[PDB]
Design a protein around this nucleic acid. Structure first.
Ligand SMILES: [Cl-]
Ligand SMILES: [Mg+2]
Lengths: 144, 106, 144, 146, 144, 38, 144, 38, 37, 53
RNA sequence: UUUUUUU
RNA sequence: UUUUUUUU
RNA sequence: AAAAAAA
RNA sequence: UUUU
RNA sequence: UUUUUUUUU
RNA sequence: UUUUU
RNA sequence: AUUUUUUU
RNA sequence: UUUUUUUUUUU
RNA sequence: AAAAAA
RNA sequence: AAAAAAA
RNA sequence: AAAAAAAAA
RNA sequence: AAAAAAAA
RNA sequence: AAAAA
RNA sequence: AAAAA
RNA sequence: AAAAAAA
């Protein structure tokens, strides 16, 4: 430790980078209608509300989802996630249901390394299906 | 903006103090959330040397259950605060929030 | 390793933070005059050029300096640093010179933990003195 | 366990996660028609069919391609087969060739796709180019349907 | 591994199978009337929604069920399962009840190895009794 | 040791007490007279 | 083992019993009235719905009780159990309450070996008090 | 061992089955004739 | 500990207001000569 | 002291307790008071581990 | 395999 | 040994 | 087999 | 590597 | 070792 | 892994 | 092993 | 079941 | 763990 | 541990 | 997975 | 970690 | 001894 | 049993 | 890591 300023015997000018990368977990919500599949846009990840308005591309690694609102009467919450890729969309429907009507329904999926390419704002991450009118998403990604 | 003057009170046996060194702040939603929603609560640490922009959020996975979140003030930022100062900003859909603040009165 | 998407058995909604902290090494340059000391504003750290226009405060940890232009004729490059603090400025003039006229001068200082508080744009971090007309600065800091 | 002779109760817990349309790692055998001196582009759509239980998929990640000469070679000749991998980011120029050392025996060759080049492909895309002196080439492709 | 394609020294043509088996966990819901037992048809397992519309026979391993809707007023959820077999229907009522009215009731039964034969769409897996109007089943089976 | 604020994954609301106990030793003086017990 | 039938070198005729004993857990529900205790009849165990209609006596080993329906408004469920014996009734009130209004209240007691005599259908097991109007029971006993 | 009743700290309602299975050895007689199978 | 402490109680536990209690009871009886009581 | 406990679920009970040190474990007769109870619920259940004599 | 409170 | 702490 | 744990 |  | 009841990670 | 002496 | 010299 | 060259992080 | 046997 | 999958 | 039930043949 | 009372 | 799932 | 604390 | 080969 130290209680005062001390000198740093610096050397040659190093290698710098003013705009580095940033591995993040981005939370946001999306509105979803009953029976309709909603495509989650990558553009929602680029925002000043996430300190990411300086990025134009991102490498998505894994996506998790939670039901943000209450389900219809008598029903338990559920949520489905169909991954989407520019080289070819998937037909998986990773679904998670709540065992309590008062609790959220959670599910997610991980993108393999071979499918971890950049995605711009115009692309889509996945489709979401749910009986609740809003879904909360947390996306672990690598902004670059 | 949560005032620091709320820590100094006879209800806490702390009416004899004028300053306090806050260490960590934790928050719980004290009332039920609006209809069809789950409880959430946010905290933005404030400092007289510079306020922060963090929004430490905690949401409940149950409409009947409280939401909870907290932050720890690093030692380098653990200075004193008087009553006129503020600790942090709270945001929530619930109309009351319970705070448990670990601090050192002096 | 896995070559396709993998389901994640997610649980309760976790704790999140859309605007976290960021430990960075911010490089920039400042113009310096002869014999006159230049107070480096903290506001230079908050810019879109460093992905930092969303922060308002920052905890500086260490400062380093290099001479960015060539020194006067027949001279060797030097650069001084004087730490400034809102509670009280220092009188230390950490100085490093160049043993080659074609080579930069370098010097830095480390801020102790007890003196690591937040600084806003209206604050100053240190003074800079050099015989060159520009000085390159790299500041290790914790944006919050 | 494995010694029971009747039904037993399962103390199930909360409702789990589910996925009615999961992935599937497969080896898909099929054949293509080839002409002499010309290269045939193998379509990815040959993998999405009810004959392979895969007519429900719309994308696939190819890993390795293996080819055998399905018909006899021309007279006085030995069988051969070539493969040129194709990628949407950029086609290759390799010619992985294998020749039969017996006129009565097939000619086999194959190539493995690196992990960095294992993205998804759709029916409109192509896998590789096939060249052979035989008229028909049987292919076995390892891939991951998703 | 590598960043490029590598030749495979293949040998003789191997043993192939264009229509292999598949071990699956099939999630589907049924409608249950009050005090009336519903026979779960095996044909609910062969569907394009499960990618299994190419199978005609399946060997069921374990059947577990969850209440999909809320119970009547003042009641806790329950669900019963009576295993059915073509060589002899059973009389067990594997019942599971919910200790919380807002929570599902779950129960399951395992089929011994000596009773794991194939079943076609005309066959029934088991009966289901419950106070709820829908039951979610996750049947672990082997499609062939 | 850390230089920034860090999140605290808090759970259920704890048991609290706004008026706790305190172990002290109090310094204070008294006036004494000669040949008299105070 | 093998795949075909095998011969058994059986010996003398063994000691047989066509009507053996059977230790079980019998789930059955009872109706309770407010502020009124209800004696549980032993004849509820002997039933064709429990495969025990062939028995006439039973040795009870333990009793367990759950509240089968919801409690009155503003209240948490509770259930009490007072053991009864032909040699002398007890005065213990093994009471179990619920910490969640939606959750069942449970309690149980164990009968010592010295008090494990037979009981016929005319006898009584215990008394059940509860603010709920129905109480589920799971009695561990030995039918003989 | 004990001499009186003991309290059982029960929990959630378990998985129950009022009609379980039963492994048995059933002894019964049949009538058989000479040179003919029954 | 010379002062009251806080007990972090959880859910409501199983209770029994009337337990069993094991005892050794002393008492006297009157006996006559030759007669069993 | 006001040893307080709060329920994190509206449907769940709130609980708290306090232990008496051996030095303060004297006897108390019927006219005495054990403690004061405050709550927003109109009824509280008490479990008191004590030694009758 | 922790132990401490009257028959 | 009284009040706050630290990776289920 | 009765008080506060049982890891 | 995919499942409950 | 298996079928149902109870214990314990 | 990513960003920092 | 806090600071300032000297230190491979 | 055993190697020569184009770059190449780390012990 | 089939069918025969110091 | 069963099934599908590369030498 | 307590009893009842073939035996390590 | 915590001012107070102690303490080879 | 610091960060971001 | 180099300096200052 | 990538190019002959070897039973
Ligand atoms: Cl991360
Ligand atoms: Mg919860």
């Amino acid at each position: 430790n130290s209680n005062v300023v001390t000198m740093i015997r610096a050397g040659s000018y190093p290698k710098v980078n003013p705009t580095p990368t940033w591995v993040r977990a981005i939370p946001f919500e999306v509105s979803v209608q009953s029976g309709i599949a909603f495509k989650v846009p990558v553009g929602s990840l680029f925002s000043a509300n996430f300190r990411t308005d300086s990025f134009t591309s991102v490498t998505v690694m894994s996506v998790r989802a939670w039901t943000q609102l209450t389900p219809p009467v008598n029903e338990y919450s559920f949520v489905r996630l169909k991954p989407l890729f520019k080289t070819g969309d998937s037909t998986e429907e990773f679904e998670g249901r709540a065992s309590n009507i008062n609790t959220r329904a959670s599910v997610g999926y991980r993108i393999p390394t071979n499918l971890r390419q950049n995605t711009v704002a115009a692309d889509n991450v996945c489709e979401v299906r749910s009986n609740c009118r809003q879904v909360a998403l947390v996306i672990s990604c690598c902004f670059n | 903006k949560v005032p620091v003057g709320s820590l100094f009170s006879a209800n806490f046996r702390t009416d004899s103090f004028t300053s306090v060194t806050v260490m960590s702040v934790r928050a719980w939603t004290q009332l039920t959330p609006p209809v069809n929603e789950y409880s959430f609560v946010r905290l933005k640490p404030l400092f007289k040397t510079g306020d922060s922009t963090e929004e430490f959020e905690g949401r409940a996975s149950n409409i009947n259950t409280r939401a909870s979140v907290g932050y720890r003030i690093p030692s380098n930022l653990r200075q004193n605060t008087v009553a006129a100062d503020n600790v942090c900003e709270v945001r929530s859909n619930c109309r009351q929030v319970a705070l448990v603040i670990s601090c050192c009165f002096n």
